[PDB]
RNA sequence: GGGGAACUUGAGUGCAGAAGAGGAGAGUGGAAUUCCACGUGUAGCGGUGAAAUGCGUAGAGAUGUGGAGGAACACCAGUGGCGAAGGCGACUCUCUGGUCUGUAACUGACGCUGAGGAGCGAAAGCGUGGGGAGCGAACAGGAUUAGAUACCCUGGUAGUCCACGCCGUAAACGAUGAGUGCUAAGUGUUAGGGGGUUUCCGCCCCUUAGUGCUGCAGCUAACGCAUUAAGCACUCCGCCUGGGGAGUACGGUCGCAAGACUGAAACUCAAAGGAAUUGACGGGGGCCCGCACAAGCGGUGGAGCAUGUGGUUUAAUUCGAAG
């Protein structure tokens, strides 16, 4: 029920920083949806785009 | 020859069990088709029990003892071969739930009623 | 609907050894009283002569050797008519064992009924009866189809 | 109505912002499937209600490496978002469209609709050159069956995919044409804005534009609709006049073709329909009972005989009875 990004008012993702994406990806490799994250709607799409570019860049794994 | 993987295919039609070297060299394998369960009797957990325990008993002639097992695909053999391998006396470290789910893959066959 | 069970023809309550129990009552599934009990007593005796030991002892040893533990029932699921085995309740066990005892007692075909039942008592005390045969038959076929449940 | 002078709300231009699977082109990544080479590996794999056809001792399936290739982008994902509609989900870049909020810095009615006309327009199909992994009409075999050109199994061609043209149709649906204004409320949700709190974390109250669900008034034959009207009104377009015959015939107009658009009549019927009610039925669902089935026992039909009935025959085999 708490949105992390509005909680500290952080702006756009800056995809190079990764450790938050680490705890936004499941341990088997999929994205945690809003049912468990509870983020705001307009940030979830830039989140999933960010972890997608991370996956293409091979810092975050497709499967684990 | 002390460890390796157990590969078990559970299907709606048949249950397969295979032991192999850690780098993939197979020693022994079994299935309900091997033990004579023919038709759709190959899908019962009891035949999964029997095939798994007889493959574990065929593992002894090269003498592996500790094991990790990969369960493959859905069906009643998902847990039956697991309990059979654990009750067979051979040490199992953990089970792995890997499924060959793609992202999309090719389209499946036609919807099997019409 | 509703499971019911009931006592029938039990003997006197106190000091009921099974020999006096089936001496005064019990088994008697041949028809009516008279030419059902007399004959049973004669069969019971012609085996004391044969083996000089306790008739009721060898009788329940015969019953024990007849006792099954598995019985199969059929099912309509699937177009192949699978059959499923279940554990037999003890009352069903004793009545069914006694049923096969009496039916191949009358089926086994000797010159008269008392020696027929006498030879059946011997051939069920030892494991060479037709009832012992069918006992192992259903036992092994239940073990064959035991995979279903 | 015509002419002349106004004005800024309608419609617009600027300025500041926001969101989007909007579109065209190019490049890139991963999971699987298939196929091939090799290592290990025995005897089955696979398949269904049973099964069988197939594939396997010429080493299959299983299993791990290493390639080849084409396909669609898991999770994200939401009665979410975008687009006029068909439709658009992996990522990156180029180009390009559109929508909404504030703002009144400028024009001053430039607006609406739209016959003809023009352009887009799912899938299947057609033309030329590619490509062809899986899938898979046709077709082959094996099943099922009284029969099975099908449902089922194993294969499998065209196509599905790309480039460029053509066809121009669908249940192309919200079965609701477009624009404008008015009319109780409640509750989500998208993208914005403003005020009090602090200009934080997030609280409240407004606020436009959508987007869902409820629900007044009103309306409807009823179902129901209801600020995203099927209410109240106005403008403009398209369309209907009983069911068949029939979107057929003729004749034009396109199309390479399949066909598409335009579209009668003769004859014939007295109905066809929509919504709802009560029943019945369901190889629909939820509960329950009955020697209904199960668990057993004894029987019938196998034999003779008695009796009733049918059929046949007789002069008549007296009539009535029929799951």
DSSP per-residue letters across B3-32: EEEEEEEE-SS-EEEEEEETTS-EEEEEET
Q: Where on strand D do bases come within 7 A of a protein Cβ?
A: 19-21, 28-33, 39-52, 61-65, 70-78, 80, 89-92, 133-136, 151-153, 189-192, 200-202, 288-290, 292, 295-297
Judged by phi (left if over 0) then psi (alpha if -120 to 50, else beta), residue C15 lies in left
Angle between helices C55-66 and C37-48 (to 10 degrees): 100
| CA dist., res. B4 & res. B20, Å (int) | 6
Distance to chain C for B50, nearest Cα, Å: 10
C22, with CB counted inside 10 A (0-12, 13-18, 19+), is buried
A/C touch flag: 3 or more CB pairs below 8 Å: no
Method: cryo-EM
Distance B110 CA to D261 C1' (A): 38
CA distance A49 to A12: 12
With CA atoms as reference, the chain B residue closest to C144 would be B37
Residue A32 CB contacts under 8 Å (≥ 6 apart), including other chains = A24, A25, A26
* CA distances, C55 to each of A29, B11, C42, C116 (Å): 76, 57, 11, 16
Element (H, E) at B92: strand B91-96
* Helical residues (DSSP H) of B1-114, grouped into ranges: 45-58, 77-87
Q: Could you tell me how many CB contacts below 8 A there are between chain B and chain C?
A: 13
Which residues in B lie closer than 8 A to residue C146 (C-beta atoms)? 46
In chain B, whose CA is at the least distance from the CA of C146?
B46
Question: For strand C83-87 and strand C70-74, is the pairing parallel, antiparallel, or unpaired?
Answer: antiparallel
Which residue in the block uniquely carries the two structure tokens 């050797």? C65
Q: How far is the CA of B43 from the C1' of D48 (A)?
A: 13
- Across-strand partners of C73? C84
Nearest to B46 among C78, C80, C146 (CB): C146
- Does the beta carbon of B41 lie under 8 angstroms from any beta carbon of chain C? yes
Give how far B1 is from chain C: nearest CA, Å.
33
C-alpha to C-alpha distance for A9 and B20, rounded to whole angstroms: 54
Q: Are 3 or more Cβ–Cβ pairs between C and B shorter than 8 Å?
A: yes
Distance of CA A36 to the CA centre of its chain: 12
Residue with tokens 């309550």: C13
Sheet holding B3-10, edge to edge: B26-31, B15-21, B3-10, B66-72, B91-96
**Which residue minimizes Cα–C1' distance to D51?**
B39
The residues, any chain, with a CB within 8 Å of residue B75's CB and separated by 6 or more, are B10, B11, B12, B15, B43
Q: Which residues of C touch B41 (CB under 8 A)?
A: 147
Resolution (A): 3.6
Q: Would you list the DSSP string of C38-102? A: HHHHHHHHHHHTTSSS-HHHHHHHHHHHH---EEEEE--STTTT-EEEEEPPHHHHHHHHHHHHH
């Amino acid at each position: 029920k708490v949105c992390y990004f509005t909680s500290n008012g952080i702006t756009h993702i800056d995809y190079k920083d990764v450790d938050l994406l680490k705890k936004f990806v499941s341990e088997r490799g999929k994205i945690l949806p809003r049912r468990v994250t509870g983020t705001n709607a307009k940030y979830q799409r830039k989140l999933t785009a960010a972890i997608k570019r991370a996956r293409q860049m091979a810092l975050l794994p497709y499967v684990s | 020859i002390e460890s390796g993987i157990a590969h078990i295919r559970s299907t709606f039609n048949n249950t397969i069990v295979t032991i192999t070297d850690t780098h993939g060299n197979a020693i022994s394998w079994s299935s309900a088709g091997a033990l004579g369960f023919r038709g759709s009797r190959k899908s019962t957990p009891f035949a999964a029990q029997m095939a798994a325990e007889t493959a574990a008993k065929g593992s002894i002639e090269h003498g592996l003892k500790t094991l990790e097992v990969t369960v493959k695909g859905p069906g009643s053999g998902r847990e039956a071969a697991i309990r059979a391998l654990q009750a067979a006396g051979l040490e199992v470290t953990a089970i792995r739930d890997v499924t060959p789910v793609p992202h999309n893959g090719c389209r499946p066959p036609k919807r099997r009623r019409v | 609907k509703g499971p019911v069970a009931k006592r029938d023809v039990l003997p006197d309550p106190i000091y009921n050894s099974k020999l006096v129990s089936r001496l005064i009552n019990k088994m008697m599934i041949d028809g009516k009283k008279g030419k059902s009990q007399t004959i049973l007593y004669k069969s019971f005796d012609i085996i004391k002569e044969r083996t000089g030991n306790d008739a009721m002892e060898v009788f329940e040893q015969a019953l024990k050797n007849i006792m099954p533990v598995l019985e199969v029932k059929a099912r309509r699921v699937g177009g192949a008519n699978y059959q499923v085995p279940v554990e037999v309740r003890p009352e069903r066990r004793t009545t069914l064992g006694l049923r096969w005892l009496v039916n191949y007692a009358r089926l086994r075909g000797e010159k008269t009924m008392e020696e027929r039942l006498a030879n059946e008592i011997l051939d069920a005390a030892n494991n060479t009866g037709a009832a012992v045969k069918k006992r192992e038959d259903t036992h092994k076929m239940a073990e064959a189809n035991k995979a279903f449940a």
